Structure formats: structure tokens, C-alpha cells
Amino acid sequence: GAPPIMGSSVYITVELAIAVLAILGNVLVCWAVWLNSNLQNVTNYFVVSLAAADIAVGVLAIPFAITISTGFCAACHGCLFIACFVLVLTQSSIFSLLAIAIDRYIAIRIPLRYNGLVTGTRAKGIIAICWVLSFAIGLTPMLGWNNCGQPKEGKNHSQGCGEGQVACLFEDVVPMNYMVYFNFFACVLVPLLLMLGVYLRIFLAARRQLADLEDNWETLNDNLKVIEKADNAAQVKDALTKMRAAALDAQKMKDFRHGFDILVGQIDDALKLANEGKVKEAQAAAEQLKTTRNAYIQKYLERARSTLQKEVHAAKSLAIIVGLFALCWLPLHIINCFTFFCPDCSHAPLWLMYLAIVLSHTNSVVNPFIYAYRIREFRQTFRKIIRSHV
Ligand SMILES: CC(C)CCC[C@@H](C)CCC[C@@H](C)CCC[C@@H](C)CCCC(=O)OC[C@@H](O)[C@@H](O)CO
Ligand SMILES: CC(C)CCC[C@@H](C)CCC[C@@H](C)CCC[C@@H](C)CCCC(=O)OC[C@@H](O)[C@@H](O)CO
Ligand SMILES: CC(C)CCC[C@@H](C)[C@H]1CC[C@H]2[C@@H]3CC=C4C[C@@H](O)CC[C@]4(C)[C@H]3CC[C@]12C
Ligand SMILES: CC(C)CCC[C@@H](C)[C@H]1CC[C@H]2[C@@H]3CC=C4C[C@@H](O)CC[C@]4(C)[C@H]3CC[C@]12C
Ligand SMILES: CC(C)CCC[C@@H](C)[C@H]1CC[C@H]2[C@@H]3CC=C4C[C@@H](O)CC[C@]4(C)[C@H]3CC[C@]12C
Ligand SMILES: Nc1nc(NCCc2ccc(O)cc2)nc2nc(-c3ccco3)nn12
Ligand SMILES: CCCCCCCCCCCCCCCCCC
Ligand SMILES: CCCCCCCCCCCCCCCCCC
Ligand SMILES: CCCCCCCCCCCCCCCCCC
Ligand SMILES: CCCCCCCCCCCCCCC
Ligand SMILES: CCCCCCCCCCCCCCC
Ligand SMILES: CCCCCCCCCCCCCCC
Ligand SMILES: CCCCCCCCCCCCCCC
Ligand SMILES: CCCCCCCCCCCCCCC
Ligand SMILES: CCCCCCCCCCCCCCC
Ligand SMILES: CCCCCCCCCCCCC
Ligand SMILES: CCCCCCCCCCCCC
Ligand SMILES: CCCCCCCCCCCCC
Ligand SMILES: CCCCCCCCCCCC
Ligand SMILES: CCCCCCCCCCC
Ligand SMILES: CCCCCCCCCC
Ligand SMILES: CCCCCCCC
Ligand SMILES: CCCCCCCC
Ligand SMILES: CCCCCCCC
Ligand SMILES: CCCCCC
Ligand code: NA
Secondary structure: OOOHHHHHHHHHHHHHHHHHHHHHHHHHHHHHHHHOHHHOOHHHHHHHHHHHHHHHHHHHHHHHHHHHHOOOEEEHHHHHHHHHHHHHHHHHHHHHHHHHHHHHHHHHHOHHHHHHHOOHHHHHHHHHHHHHHHHHHHOHHHHOOOOOOOOOHHHHHHHOOOOOEEEOOHHHHOOHHHHHHHHHHHHHHHHHHHHHHHHHHHHHHHHHHHHHHHHHHHHHHHHHHHHHOOOOHHHHHHHHHHHHHHHHHHHOOHHHHHHHHHHHHHHHHHHHHHHOOOHHHHHHHHHHHHHHHHHHHHHHHHHHHHHHHHHHHHHHHHHHHHHHHHHHHHHHHHHHHHHHHOOOOOOOOHHHHHHHHHHHHHHHHHHHHHHHHHOHHHHHHHHHHHHHHO
16 A cells, blocks of 8 residues: 555645634634624624634644544543544534524524524623533543443554553444444434524515405405496495504504505594494595505515515525535444444545544535625625725
């Protein structure tokens, strides 16, 4: 086989390239949120926590990955810290992605309660708790779920390690049952399936809200046509009963309120005429509603639709981030499943292990590109920072 330094040189060069780009792009994200008060909202506090975890991949996890590739002699607990630190950063990423999804689900489900429920102060406390939990989950092997008690004595003596020392190789110190059942199934796949569930629920909520606005609108217009081609008070009365219910529903901001006030008032004016049997006076009064609709109600309808469409576009952008996380991490998890569940299978070759490691690290480069492409407020801020400060 080719001298191992040759494959190592390629691996290390690739890891350093990824580290440089992870740091630069994620620093830009943080700098943008810092500069632009329009980016300073609770959603973007989780974006910043996620960017911090990605900067720590370039600054720490990649140098650790380079180190552990050598199989250097180390105290087994020092070795575990180097092997497991990236699991803390990845767990922190999962908590941030889950928080973003739930945040967007609260914003679309109860918009009026959002600002008083989801505050900056609460977000900061959740981020701190999530970072503590990420340390506890990713460094669980350091608590004694590890192979330090069953060292590879042949590798230890071949590499010349001292006493209490092991050849520091990931799959010699970190148990595969930890990596498959605890890390992958419980701590990554369950949260990814939950996020999939939350985004589903966001898109279902948006679609139901957009459908309800269109139905209210159509109830308005159809009942207007019922009233026109009507032939007695009872008919005009029944339609105006529908319209009034529909109009109070659409209502649920001074220029807005004046609109629904006029409309409801006109509906009651025409209701009083109908109840008095005055059918043509009722119909004339109902014809008035058309100018209230054209001048106020169509404006509110188009603004509510535009807000919901923006929320759908934003939820697609954030879900793409989750999909790219899944694409970059699953290969390594799936290889661990083959290693663990298929002892009769040939182990994935080294070149494939290193490709899957590098792919996982590339995930710390991509988020700044998704933001620049998909989110106008980020792209415009990145442009200002690059033109001005470079
Ligand atoms: C990547 C780049 C674009 C930016 C990096 C920024 C800076 C701050 C990186 C900092 C790197 C350090 C944290 C690296 C730590 C390296 C440690 C883990 C190396 C350990 C090697 C060691 O212990 O020596 C080996 C022998 O001592 C052993 O065989 C005997 O005990
Ligand atoms: C995010 C996505 C949209 C795009 C991601 C792009 C991905 C595929 C990264 C591309 C990099 C590769 C084309 C090149 C990497 C080649 C590396 C993995 C070769 C390593 C060879 C190897 O096995 O060396 C290690 C061993 O020889 C041993 O010495 C221990 O280091
Ligand atoms: C602020 C940032 C830069 C601090 C980074 C400190 C890092 C590099 C320190 C903290 C704990 C350290 C480890 C502690 C113990 C051991 C076991 C020893 O047998 C080999 C070195 C090794 C594996 C150390 C490597 C360096 C290490 C990982
Ligand atoms: C999430 C997307 C990108 C799917 C990627 C699936 C990857 C991880 C799959 C596709 C084919 C798979 C390989 C197919 C066959 C073998 C041979 C066996 O002896 C060890 C596992 C190994 C080497 C598998 C590892 C995982 C593998 C590389
Ligand atoms: C993509 C998300 C939603 C699901 C993840 C699917 C994972 C857990 C699946 C996909 C392919 C599966 C593997 C397919 C084939 C084998 C070989 C068998 O001898 C042991 C089980 C094993 C190794 C499976 C383990 C679980 C596995 C890796
Ligand atoms: N299985 C595994 N191996 C390694 N590194 C060692 C690659 C290797 C595997 C076998 C061998 O004999 C020599 C080297 N890093 C690893 N990182 C992860 C990981 C992180 C998150 C999910 O899986 N899994 N993983
Ligand atoms: C991109 C800047 C320069 C890139 C670094 C060059 C890579 C050469 C370093 C080789 C060191 C190898 C150490 C031992 C590896 C053996 C692992 C089995
Ligand atoms: C918002 C600021 C981020 C806060 C980060 C602080 C994290 C401190 C370290 C966590 C301590 C947990 C210890 C559990 C693992 C012990 C294994 C040796
Ligand atoms: C296993 C599910 C993975 C599916 C991937 C979803 C991503 C879709 C990509 C379309 C939109 C991408 C926007 C910009 C792409 C830049 C990539 C660096
Ligand atoms: C070896 C380093 C790998 C980093 C690859 C990251 C890809 C990010 C997407 C860039 C797309 C830019 C297209 C511009 C037209
Ligand atoms: C402010 C952080 C700068 C840290 C630079 C650390 C460089 C680490 C070199 C490791 C040498 C290990 C060689 C073993 C003999
Ligand atoms: C900054 C406030 C401290 C946060 C306290 C974390 C509470 C931990 C509760 C149970 C821990 C379960 C860890 C799973 C391994
Ligand atoms: C054999 C070395 C083990 C070191 C573990 C000592 C620290 C206690 C762990 C407390 C974790 C609390 C985190 C909050 C859930
Ligand atoms: C989302 C699917 C998760 C389920 C994957 C579980 C696979 C268990 C594999 C058992 C293999 C047993 C091998 C014995 C020879
Ligand atoms: C990084 C994940 C995608 C990798 C796709 C490559 C598939 C080739 C697998 C062949 C390896 C077979 C070796 C076993 C003897
Ligand atoms: C705007 C409030 C968000 C604060 C998030 C900062 C996260 C920093 C954690 C650093 C841990 C790296 C090891
Ligand atoms: C309100 C915006 C504040 C930006 C916080 C920057 C956090 C960067 C921490 C990176 C740590 C990596 C070592
Ligand atoms: C006594 C040698 C092995 C002990 C391993 C300690 C690693 C954890 C300390 C790191 C501190 C983080 C800043
Ligand atoms: C600039 C960052 C330097 C990368 C750290 C390389 C550490 C490799 C250690 C080899 C252990 C014997
Ligand atoms: C991979 C993104 C490239 C960023 C271009 C330069 C921005 C500099 C940020 C400050 C360190
Ligand atoms: C575990 C991550 C969940 C974060 C939820 C988002 C805000 C809720 C505050 C009441
Ligand atoms: C592997 C399941 C997670 C995928 C979620 C992506 C949403 C489009
Ligand atoms: C259903 C799980 C039992 C199989 C365990 C296989 C571990 C090699
Ligand atoms: C024996 C090496 C085959 C594949 C090399 C890696 C592809 C990028
Ligand atoms: C210049 C960095 C060299 C990488 C470690 C051998
Ligand atoms: Na990450």
C-alpha cells in the first residue's frame, strides 16, 4: 500500500480548507446579526448559536479530527475528549435547528401571543441550557460509556504507548453501541424526525390559513350575488346573516379596523331594512358593501396572503438547512450502523471513512450560503459588510 502520509496529506489539506471556510462564512453570519437590527430577532439568536457551533468546528473539531487521524499515544480520557468534542457541537446544532422549527411553528400558529411568549431573554436561557445538555450528551463516553477498560494491547505496544495510554483511534475508544443507539437513534434521528413533523405542521397551518381567507372572501362575494338576484327580505336576510359571520372571522391597523367597522355597520344597516321587510332598500344598502370591499377588505386580504406566503418561503429556507444537515451527517451514521449491526460485513474502507468525516465537516460551510441565497435581509447585509469592510 501507498505510504500513509500521502493519503494523510490530502485529508489534512482538505480539513484545513473546510475549517477556513467554516470560520469565515459563520463569522460573517454573526457580524451581520450584530450590524443589522432587522436581523436581531429570536429566530436569529438560534441562527447565531448554530453559527458559533460551526465556527467551533473550524477552530477546534477539525484540529482534533486531524490529531485523532494519526492514532497518537494519549491518556484514554484525553483521547475521548478529542474524539467526542465534535459530538457536543453537533448536538448543539440539533438543539438550535429544533428551536428554529418550533419558533416558526409558534409564529404561524399564535402570531398574537408570539412576542410575549418567545422573548430574547427566554431565547438566551434556552440557548445556554441547550449548550449544557450538548456537553452532557456529547461527552457521555467520558462518564464511563467507553472502551478505555478494554484497550487494544497490540496497537498500544506497536505504537509504543506509555502506561494508561492508548493509540487514540475513534473506533477503539468510543463504543459503537453509544454511537448507534444513543448518539444516532436517540440524539440525532429522533430530533430530525421531530423537525420534519414541525415543518409539516407549519406548511399545513399556512395552507389551512390561506384556504380560510379565500373561503371568507368567496363567502362575501357569493352572498353579495345571492342578495342582488334575490326576490324577498328572508333571502336577503339569510345571506346577510352569512356575510356578517364571515366578516367578523376575517377581522380576528387603524386603516384596517376602520374597514371592518364600515363593512359590519353596512351589513347591520341592511339587516335592519330586511327585518322591516324593506327588500329593495336592503339590496341598495348591501350594494354599498362593494366599495368597502374594494377600498379596505381586498387590501387586508392581500396583506394577510403576502405575510403567510413569506412565512412559507422562510420555513422552506430553514428546512433546507435541516435537509443539508441530514445529508452531511447521515453517511457517517449509516456506516456506523453497518459496522455495528453487520459484523460479517467488511468494514467501510479508510478512504470512505475519511470522505464521510470530511462531508460531515462541510456542513459547517453551507449555512451562510443558504442564508445569502434565500434570505434577502442576510444577502443585503453580507453585501454591505463585504463592500465597506473589504
Ligand atoms: C484550522 C485553522 C484554519 C484555524 C485554527 C485556529 C487555532 C486557534 C487552532 C488551535 C488548535 C489547537 C486547539 C490544537 C490542539 C492540538 C492537540 C489536540 C494536539 C495533541 C498532540 C499531543 O498531545 O501530542 C502527541 C504526543 O504528546 C503523544 O503521542 C504522547 O503523549
Ligand atoms: C455539502 C455538499 C453540498 C457538498 C460537499 C462536498 C464533499 C463531497 C467534499 C468533497 C471532498 C473530496 C472530493 C475530497 C476528499 C478526499 C479525502 C477524503 C481522501 C482521504 C484519503 C484517506 O483515506 O486518507 C486517510 C488515510 O490514508 C490515513 O493515512 C489516515 O489519515
Ligand atoms: C481555548 C481553547 C483553544 C482551548 C483548547 C484546549 C485543548 C486543546 C486541550 C484541553 C484538554 C487537552 C487534552 C487533555 C489530555 C490529553 C491526554 C494526553 O495524553 C495527550 C494530550 C491530551 C489529548 C490533551 C490535548 C489538548 C486538549 C484537548
Ligand atoms: C444520505 C445519502 C447521501 C445516502 C448515502 C448512503 C451511504 C452512506 C451508503 C450507500 C452504500 C453504502 C455502502 C454499501 C456497502 C458496504 C460494504 C460493507 O462491507 C460495509 C458498509 C458499506 C461500505 C456501505 C456503507 C454506507 C454506504 C456508503
Ligand atoms: C434516513 C432515516 C430517516 C432513516 C435511517 C435509516 C438507517 C437507520 C438504515 C438504512 C439502511 C439500514 C441498513 C441496511 C442493511 C443492513 C445490513 C444488516 O446486516 C444489518 C442492518 C443494516 C446495517 C441496516 C441498519 C439500518 C440502516 C443503516
Ligand atoms: N466511526 C467513526 N470513525 C471515526 N474515525 C476513525 C475512522 C477509522 C475507522 C476504523 C479504523 O480502523 C481507522 C480509522 N470518526 C468518526 N466520527 C464518527 C461520527 C461522528 C458523528 C457520527 O459519527 N464516527 N466515526
Ligand atoms: C494547506 C496547507 C498545507 C497542507 C499541509 C500539508 C500536509 C503534510 C503533513 C503531513 C504530516 C503527517 C503526520 C502523520 C500522519 C500519519 C497518519 C496515519
Ligand atoms: C451562552 C453561552 C454558552 C454557555 C456555555 C457554557 C458551557 C460550560 C460547560 C458545560 C458543563 C457541563 C459538564 C458536563 C460534562 C462533564 C464531562 C467531563
Ligand atoms: C435527505 C434529504 C436531503 C435533501 C436536500 C434538500 C436541499 C434542496 C436544495 C434546493 C435549494 C438549495 C438552495 C441553495 C443551494 C446551495 C447549496 C450549497
Ligand atoms: C474542499 C472544500 C469544500 C467546500 C464546498 C462547499 C460548497 C458550498 C456551496 C458553494 C456554491 C457556490 C456557487 C456560486 C455560483
Ligand atoms: C491561541 C491558540 C494557539 C494554539 C497553537 C497550538 C499549536 C499546537 C501544536 C501541537 C504540537 C504537538 C506536537 C507533538 C510533539
Ligand atoms: C444554565 C442553567 C443550567 C442548566 C441545567 C441542566 C439541567 C439538566 C437536567 C437533567 C440532565 C440530563 C442529562 C442527560 C445526560
Ligand atoms: C472518570 C472521569 C469522570 C468525570 C465526571 C465528573 C463530572 C460529573 C458530571 C456532572 C454532569 C452534569 C451536567 C448537567 C446535566
Ligand atoms: C428508521 C429505521 C430504524 C430501524 C433500524 C434498526 C435496524 C436493526 C438491525 C438489526 C440487525 C440484527 C443483525 C443480527 C444478525
Ligand atoms: C460519502 C457517502 C457517499 C459514498 C458513495 C460511494 C459508494 C461506494 C461504496 C463502495 C465501497 C465498497 C467497499 C467494500 C468492499
Ligand atoms: C444573541 C444571543 C445568542 C448567544 C449565542 C452564543 C453561543 C456561544 C457558545 C460558544 C460555545 C463554543 C464552544
Ligand atoms: C447579538 C450578536 C452577538 C454575536 C455573538 C458572537 C458569538 C461567537 C462565538 C464563537 C466561538 C467559537 C470559538
Ligand atoms: C489527566 C489526563 C486526562 C484528563 C482529560 C481531561 C480533559 C478535560 C479537560 C478539558 C477542559 C476544557 C477546557
Ligand atoms: C493551524 C492548526 C494546526 C493543526 C494541528 C495539527 C496537530 C497535529 C498533531 C499531530 C500529533 C502527533
Ligand atoms: C466562505 C465565506 C467567505 C467570506 C468572505 C470574506 C468575509 C470576511 C469575514 C470576516 C473574517
Ligand atoms: C428544545 C428547544 C425548544 C425551543 C423552543 C423555542 C421557544 C419556546 C419558549 C417558550
Ligand atoms: C431525515 C429526515 C429529516 C429531513 C427533514 C428535511 C425537511 C425537508
Ligand atoms: C434489535 C437489536 C438486536 C441486535 C443487536 C446487534 C448488535 C451487533
Ligand atoms: C482506493 C481509493 C478509491 C477512492 C478514492 C477517493 C475518491 C474521492
Ligand atoms: C501547516 C499545518 C501543518 C499541519 C500539521 C502537520
Ligand atoms: Na453544525
